[PDB]
Every structure is written in C-alpha cells, then in structure tokens.
C-alpha cells in the first residue's frame, strides 16, 4: 500500500528537469502569492528599514508532477525542494534576509493531484524603506515590500495575489511599540528593465507614529522649561544672581535637550517638525534672558510688567500656529 505511494513519487522525479520551467517555450506559469504576516519587529529610523517576519507561500501548477492513483494531498519533506522547479522570486528592497532552520529548514512542499505545488517558506526579512521625516514626530510613513521575479520575464512567469484582498492576512494583529498600521494595499504591476519586462507585486503598509511617547518625553519638558524662564520676571531687578542663574539654566536645558534628541535620528540636513519647536522655544527662552539685560541696562517696572503679559500671549499664539499646521 505504501509502496504504491513510494513508487509514484519515484516515477515523478525520474526524468524531471529542474533547469526548465513548466510549459517551457509556451504559455507562462501563473504563480499565486499568499503572504501571511507574523510580526513586524523594528521600524528603525536610523537605518531606514523595517524588519518583517512572514509566512511567504507560492502556488503554481506543474503538469509533470501530476499523480492520479492516490486521491490525497501529498506532503513531501522539505528536502525535495532541491529536485523540483521553484520560482526565483526575490524582494527588491531586501537588505538582509534568512529562512529559519530550526529544527529543520522551515519549508513546505505539498503536491496536489492536479499538479499544483504549494511551496511555502518562513522568511524574516529586513526591507529597506525610505522615510520622509519632515513632519517628525507627527509624521505618517509608507513602507513597501516589493516582490519580483528575477530571471523570468513577463512572458515566462506572471504573478497574482491569490484571493484578491484576502491574500495578505495577519496584519491587523501586528502591534508596534511606537507605530500603528492603518492601511495596507496590494498592487500588481510590471516594471521594465534593460533585460526585459518583469512582473512585480508590492505589499505596502501605512504607518502612523504615536505621539504619546514623544509628547511626554520631549514636548512636555520643552514647554515646561519656558515656564521656568517666565519665573524670572516675577523676581525683582536687584536680585541679579537669582535671575541670571534662572536664565542660564533655561537656556542650557533647552540647549542640551536639542542635543539629547538628534543622536537617535539619522543625520538628515532638513529641519524636522520637532526641531522647529525646539528652535522656536529656544527663541522665547533667549528673549527672556535678553529681557533682563534690557532691564539691567535701563536702571544701572514698566518694562518688566509688559513682559509678564506679552509672553503668555505670543507663546500661546505660537502653540496655536504650531498645532494647526502639522496636525
């Protein structure tokens, strides 16, 4: 009974040519993609990439692997992939990726009686994703994973998502510690290189950065130091050591905070939206220290009482302008 199954597999692989695709010289093969996301680990802004662990799975039809006696979905070992034709699918923006090999190589081949093969892998990839950080940390990114065939053109292979919008699953349960997956789209297209035109599928995620970590670690101390700069107006003019020690501290704390925030970011030359706030808060802090130097130059109470009303007006107006343009 088992020897019928054993000699059917041995009949299939005898005379098989791995070097030729199915229907070689004729119609192209249709390969269906069934990616299943397990995790998204590290969306690192420094290296401009994200780490993705998936359950990548392909399905095509090979007419040489057609058995008819056994009415079962045969599942072979993962070491028969070295003897069967598989597509040469690669990811374009792959920085570094590996297939897990514990306890054996994570790989599945399931031969169906009509010739369908359901090759599938567990792939952890680090896809490169170019980030626009001009509205950081209120920004909204778009990281793409682009699946393409390498050696086979459009007239030798053609790709499609199997199940339309139900091809990619498991993306709703993905929890990121500082992002949140809003939308995901599936695009079937064809790109053209100098060697020919190749099919391409692209799975891409829409990411929205959570403000709540960045609003209490950066924004709330940054507006607090400006309030400590406002206490110097209520101090009398003759107490020179108290106002200078308050005025130096609010300058240097805002100076150090600007240098305690950009070392965990890439060295981008443009100005991000949290750098315009820190520079704007540095102006209001430095204008408070310049206010006392005007007061000391005049004497050595009308100017000091004017700064106690002008500063709560313009700085609150600055936050109205700031939290209406970036949000």
């Amino acid at each position: 009974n088992m020897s019928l199954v054993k000699e059917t597999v041995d009949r299939l692989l005898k005379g098989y040519d791995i070097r030729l695709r199915p229907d070689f010289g004729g119609p192209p093969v249709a390969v269906g993609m069934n990616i299943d996301i397990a995790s998204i680990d590290m969306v690192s802004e420094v290296n401009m990439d994200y780490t993705l662990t998936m359950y990548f799975q392909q399905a095509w039809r090979d007419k040489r692997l057609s058995y008819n006696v056994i009415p079962l979905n045969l599942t072979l070992d993962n070491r028969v992939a070295d003897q069967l034709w598989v597509p040469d699918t690669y990811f374009l923006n792959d920085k570094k990726s590996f297939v897990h090999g514990v306890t054996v190589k994570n790989r599945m081949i399931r031969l169906h009686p009509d010739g369908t093969v359901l090759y599938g892998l567990r792939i952890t990839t680090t896809a490169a994703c170019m980030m626009d950080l001009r509205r950081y940390p209120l920004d909204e990114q778009n990281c793409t994973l682009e699946i393409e065939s390498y050696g086979y053109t459009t007239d030798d292979i053609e790709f499609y998502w199997r199940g339309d919008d139900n091809a990619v699953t498991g993306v709703t349960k993905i929890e990121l510690p500082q992002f949140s997956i809003v939308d995901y789209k599936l695009i079937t297209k064809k790109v053209v290189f100098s060697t020919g035109s190749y099919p391409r599928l692209s799975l891409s995620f829409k990411l929205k950065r959570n403000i709540g970590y960045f609003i209490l670690q950066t924004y709330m101390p940054s507006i607090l130091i400006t309030i400590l700069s406002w206490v110097s107006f209520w101090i009398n003019y003759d107490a020179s050591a108290a106002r200078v020690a308050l005025g130096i501290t609010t300058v240097l704390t805002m100076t150090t905070i600007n240098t305690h925030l950009r070392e965990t970011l890439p060295k981008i030359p443009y100005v991000k939206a949290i750098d315009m706030y820190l520079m704007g808060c540095f102006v209001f802090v430095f204008m408070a220290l310049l206010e006392y130097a005007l007061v000391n130059y005049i004497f050595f109470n009308a100017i000091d009482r004017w700064s106690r009303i002008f500063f709560p007006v313009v700085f609150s107006f600055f936050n109205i302008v700031y939290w209406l343009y970036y949000v």
Binding site: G101, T103, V104, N106, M108
Partner: peptide, 16 residues
C-alpha cells in the same frame, strides 16, 4: 532517516 519538521512559531532566531 525521516525527521519531523518541528519549528518554533514564536522564535525570532534559533540555532543548534
């Protein structure tokens, strides 16, 4: 001989 294909589902990285 035949060895079952036991894989760890929540393993980020593993090696024997």
């Amino acid at each position: 001989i035949w060895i079952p294909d036991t894989f760890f589902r929540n393993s980020k990285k593993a090696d024997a």
